[PDB]
Amino acid sequence: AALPSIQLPVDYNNLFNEITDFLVTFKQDTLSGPKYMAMLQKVANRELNSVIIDLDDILQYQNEKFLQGTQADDLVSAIQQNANHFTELFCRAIDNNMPLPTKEIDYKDDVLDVILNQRRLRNERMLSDRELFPPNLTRRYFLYFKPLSQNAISSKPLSVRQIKGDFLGQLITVRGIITRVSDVKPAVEVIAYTCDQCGYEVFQEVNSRTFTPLSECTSEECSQNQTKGQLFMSTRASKFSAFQECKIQELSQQVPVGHIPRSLNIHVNGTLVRSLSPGDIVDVTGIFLPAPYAGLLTETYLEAQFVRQHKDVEERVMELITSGDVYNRLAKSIAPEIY
Amino acid sequence: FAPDAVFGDRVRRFQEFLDTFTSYRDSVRSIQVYNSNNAANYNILPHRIIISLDDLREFDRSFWSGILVEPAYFIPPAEKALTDLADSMDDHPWKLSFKGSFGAHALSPRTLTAQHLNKLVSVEGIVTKTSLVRPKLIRSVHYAAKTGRFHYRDYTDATTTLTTRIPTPAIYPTEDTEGNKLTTEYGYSTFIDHQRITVQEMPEMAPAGQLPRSIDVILDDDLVDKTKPGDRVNVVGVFKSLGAGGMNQSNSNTLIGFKTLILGNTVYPLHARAARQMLTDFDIRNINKLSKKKDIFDILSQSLAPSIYGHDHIKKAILLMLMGGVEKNLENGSHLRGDINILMVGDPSTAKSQLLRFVLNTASLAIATTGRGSSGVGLTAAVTTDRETGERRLEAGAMVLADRGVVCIDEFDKMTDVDRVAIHEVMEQQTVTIAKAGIHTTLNARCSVIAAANPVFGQYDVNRDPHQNIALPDSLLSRFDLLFVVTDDINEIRDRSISEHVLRTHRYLPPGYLEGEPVRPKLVTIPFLRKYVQYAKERVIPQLTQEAINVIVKNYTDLRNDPITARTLETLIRLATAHAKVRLSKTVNKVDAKVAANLLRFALLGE
DNA sequence: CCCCCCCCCCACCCCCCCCCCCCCCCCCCCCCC
DNA sequence: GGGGGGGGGGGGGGGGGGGGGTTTTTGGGGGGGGGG
Ligand SMILES: Nc1ncnc2c1ncn2[C@@H]1O[C@H](COP(=O)(O)OP(=O)(O)NP(=O)(O)O)[C@@H](O)[C@H]1O
Ligand SMILES: [Mg+2]
Ligand SMILES: [Zn+2]
What is the rounded CA–CA span in Å between residue B75 and residue B95? 9
For B356, residues 6+ apart whose C-beta sits below 8 A from its C-beta are B368, B408, B409, B410, B450, B452
Determine the 3-state secondary structure of A82 from DSSP: coil
Using the CB atom, is residue B169 less than 7 Å from strand C? yes
Cα-only R_g, chain A:
26
- How many Å apart are CA B263 and CA B219, to the nearest integer? 7
Collapsing DSSP to helix, strand or coil, A230 comes out as strand
Burial class (CB in 10 A: 0-12, 13-18, 19+), B567: exposed
Would you list the DSSP string of B224-270?
A: TTS--TT-EEEEEEEEEEES-TT-STT---SS---EEEEEEEEEEE-
Q: N- to C-terminal Cα distance for chain B?
A: 82
Q: For B428, phi and psi rounded to 5 degrees?
A: -80, -35
Q: Residue A101: name the closest of A43, A176, A162 by CA.
A: A43
For an interface test with A, which of B42, B131, B134, B226 has the most A Cβ atoms less than 10 Å from its Cβ? B134
Query: Which residues, chain by chain, have CB under 5 Å from ion ligand 2?
Result: B 352-353, 452
Instruction: Name residues whose C-beta falls within 8 Å of residue B67's C-beta, 6 or more positions apart in sequence.
Output: B53, B56, B74, B75, B78, B98, B120
Rounded to an integer, what distance in angstroms lies between the CA atom of residue B32 and that of residue B38?
10
Alpha helices, H only, chain A? 12-25, 35-44, 55-67, 75-81, 83-97, 111-127, 135-138, 220-223, 313-323, 326-332
Contact B352 CB / ligand 1 (< 6 Å): yes
Instruction: Please tell me the distance from the alpha carbon of residue A250 to that of residue A175, in angstroms, as a whole number.
Output: 7
- Residue B436, CB, less than 7 Å from strand D? yes
Confirm if B478 and B341 have CB atoms less than 8 A apart: no
Residue type, A188: V
Q: Is B353 in the pocket of ligand 1 (CB under 6 A)?
A: yes
Question: Cβ contact (<8 Å) for B191 and A168?
Answer: yes
The pair phi, psi for residue B141, each rounded to 5°, is -125, 140
Three-state DSSP state, A324: coil
Strands B106-107 and B120-128, by their bridges, are: parallel
SS3 A14: helix
Cβ-Cβ contacts under 8 Å between A and B: the total is 132
Listed in sequence order, the residues at least 6 apart from B445 whose beta carbon sits closer than 8 Å to its beta carbon are: B380, B399, B400, B402, B403, B425, B426, B430, B431, B432
* Contact (CB<8Å) B403/A169: no
Considering only residues 392-411 of chain B, list those whose CB is below 7 Å from strand D. Answer: 392
What one-letter code names the amino acid at B399? M
Nearest one of B99, B93, B11, B86 to B53, comparing CA atoms: B99
- Which nucleotides of strand D are protein-proximal, with an atom < 7 A from a CB? 22-25
Residue B227 burial by CB count (10 A; 0-12/13-18/19+): exposed, middle or buried?
A: buried
Collapsing DSSP states into helix, strand and coil, what is residue A58? helix
The method of structure determination was cryo-EM
Helix locations, A148-267, DSSP H: 220-223
Q: Is the CB of A30 under 7 A from strand C?
A: no
- Asked if A261 and B405 come within 8 Å (Cβ–Cβ), the reply is no
Of B531, B558, B575, which Cα lies nearest the Cα of B282?
B531
Task: Report how far apart, in Å, the C-alpha atoms of A213 and of each of A210, A220, A313 are.
Answer: 10, 19, 56
**Residue of A267, A265, A275, A278 lying closest to A243 (CA atoms):** A267
- How, if at all, do strands B120-128 and B232-242 pair? antiparallel
- Which protein residue's CA is at the shortest distance from atom 26 of ligand 1? B348
How big is the CA angle at A252 (ends A246 and A254), to the nearest 5 degrees?
90
Beta-strand pair A5-6/B134-144: unpaired
Nearest to residue A47, comparing CAs of A55, A56, A59, A38?
A: A38
Is B273 an 8 Å CB contact of chain A?
A: no
Strand C close residues, chain B 275-334, CB < 7 angstroms: none
Give the separation between CA A277 and CA B218, rounded to whole angstroms.
Answer: 37
Q: Is the CB of B348 under 6 A from ligand 1?
A: yes
Given a contact cutoff of 8 angstroms between Cβ atoms, the answer to whether A97 and A25 are in contact is: no
String of b and e for B255-269 (b: at least 16 CB within 10 Å)? Answer: eeeeebbbbbbbbbe
**Rounded (10°) CA dihedral A118, A119, A122, A127:** -140
Give me the residue from B157, B394, B400 closest to A296, CB to CB. Answer: B157
Of B476, B399, B406, B405, the residue nearest B445 (C-alpha): B399
Q: Is any atom of nucleic acid chain D found less than 7 Å from the CB of residue B385?
A: yes
Q: Check if the beta carbon of residue A204 is closer than 8 Å to that of residue A191.
A: yes
Give the closest residue (by CA) to ligand 1 atom 14.
B349
User: In whole angstroms, what is the distance from residue A141 CA to residue A94 CA?
Assistant: 10
Give CA separation, B342 vs B174, B297, B365, B371, B482, in Å.
64, 18, 17, 16, 5
Chain A residues in contact with chain B using a Cβ-Cβ cutoff of 8 Å: 1-8, 12, 81-85, 152, 161, 164-166, 168-170, 179-180, 249, 252, 255-262, 287, 289-290, 292, 294-298, 300
Round to whole Å and give the CA distance between A220 and A208: 27
For chain B, the maximum distance between any two Cα atoms, rounded to a whole number of angstroms, is 100
Concatenating the DSSP letter of every residue in A18-53 gives HHHHHHHH---GGG---HHHHHHHHHHTTS--EEEE
Nearest partner of A145 among A75, A51, A25, judged by Cα: A51
B437 touches strand D (CB under 7 A): yes
Resolution in A: 3.2
CA distances from A283 to A167, A250, A251, B101 (A): 17, 11, 12, 49
- Mind telling me how many Å the CA of A338 is from chain B's nearest CA? 13
Q: Do residues B474 and B334 lie in contact, with contact meaning Cβ atoms separated by under 8 Å?
A: no
Q: Are B397 and B304 in contact (CB under 8 A)?
A: no
Exposure on the CB side of residue B18, measured as CA atoms within 13 A:
26
Q: With beta carbons less than 8 A apart as the criterion, state whether B51 and B28 touch.
A: no
What distance in Å separates the CA atoms of residue A162 and residue B605, rounded to the nearest whole number? 51
- CB burial of B443-455 (b: ≥16 within 10 Å; e: otherwise) equals bbbbbbbbbbbbb
**Chain A 188-247 contacts with nucleic strand C (CB below 7 A):** 212
Amino acid residing at B351: A
Chain A residue numbers with beta carbons less than 8 Å from the beta carbon of B173 are 1, 3
Grouping H, G, I as helix, E, B as strand and the rest as coil, residue B189 is strand
Contact criterion met (CB below 8 Å) for B353 and B452 = yes
Q: Choose, out of A260, A264, A337, the residue to mutate when testing the contact with B (most B CBs < 10 Å).
A: A260
Residue A127 neighbours by CB distance under 10 Å: 9
How many whole angstroms separate alpha carbon B236 and alpha carbon B124?
9
Q: One-letter amino acid identity for A148?
A: L
Give the other-Cβ count within 10 Å of A74's Cβ. Answer: 14
Q: Which of residues 224-263 of B touch A (CB under 8 A)?
A: 225, 228, 230
- Rounded to whole angstroms, how far apart are CA atoms B534 and A27? 58
CB < 8 Å from A in window 41-100 of B: 42
Cβ distance B462 to A279 under 8 Å? no
| Integer Cα distance of B45 and B26 in angstroms | 14
B525 vs B514: CA distance, rounded Å: 25
- Residue A237 CA, distance from chain mean position: 22
> Residues for chain A: how many in total?
339
Query: B38 C-alpha to center of ligand 2: Å?
Result: 53
Closest CA to B332 of A262, A166, A337, A196: A337
φ/ψ of B199, rounded to 5, equals -95, 120
Atom of ligand 1 nearest to the CA of B310: 1
Q: Residue B292: in which H helix or E strand, if any?
A: none
Q: Report the relative pairing of strands B95-99 and B48-52 from DSSP bridges.
A: parallel
Handedness of CA A325, A328, A331, A333 (dihedral sign): negative
- CB neighbourhood size of A180 (10 A): 15
Q: How far is residue B326 from each of residues A49, B401, B536, B569, B578, measured CA to CA in Å?
A: 52, 20, 12, 15, 8
**Which of B273, B262, B256, B237 lies closest to B97 in space, CA to CA?**
B237
What are the Cα distances from residue B546, in Å, to A15, B543, B553? 66, 10, 10
- Non-local (6+) Cβ contacts of A130 within 8 A are none
Answer yes or no: are the C-beta atoms of B421 and B462 closer than 8 Å. Answer: no
Taking the C-alpha atoms of residue B13 and residue B5, their distance in angstroms, rounded to an integer, is 14
B119 neighbors B239 (Cβ within 8 angstroms): yes
User: Which residues of A are less than 8 Å from B394 in CB distance?
Assistant: 260
Q: Which residue's C-alpha comes closest to atom 7 of ligand 1?
A: B351
Which residues in chain B touch residue A300, judged by CB atoms under 8 angstroms apart?
A: 134-135
- Residues B143/B234, Cβ–Cβ less than 8 Å: no
Ligand 1 atom nearest to B486, measured from its CA = 21
Q: How many CB atoms lie within 10 A of CB B313?
A: 20
- B399 contacts on A by Cβ (under 8 Å): none
In ligand 1, the atom with minimum distance to the C-alpha of B356 is: 17
Query: Residue ranges of B for the binding site for ATP?
Result: 346-353
Nearest atom within ligand 1 for CA of residue B347: 27
